[PDB]
């Protein structure tokens, strides 16, 4: 959750 706190809304910047 440290980085992935947008699990309920994945976006482009969150590409990994
Ligand atoms: Zn994000």
Cβ partners under 8 Å of residue 4, min gap 6: 14
Inter-residue contact 11 to 3 (CB < 8 Å): no
Report the C-alpha gap between 5 and 14 in whole angstroms. Answer: 10
- Cα of 13 from ligand 1 centre, angstroms: 6
Buried b (16+ CB within 10 A) or exposed e, 1-16: eeeeeeeeeeeeeeee
Give residue 8 CA to ligand 1 midpoint distance, Å.
Answer: 9
The answer to whether 15 and 6 are in contact (CB under 8 A) is no
Q: How far is ligand 1, taken at its centre, from the CA of residue 16, in Å?
A: 10
Solved with: NMR
Q: Which two tokens stand for residue 10?
A: 């994945």
Backbone angles phi, psi at 13, to 5 degrees: -65, -15
The residues near 9 (Cβ < 8 Å, ≥ 6 apart) are none
Evaluate whether 6 touches 14 at the Cβ level (below 8 Å). yes
Mapping DSSP onto H, E and C, the string for 1-16 reads CCCCCCCCCCCHHHCC
Distance of CA 6 to the CA centre of its chain: 4
């Amino acid at each position: 959750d440290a980085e992935f706190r947008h699990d309920s809304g994945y976006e482009v910047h969150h590409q990994k």
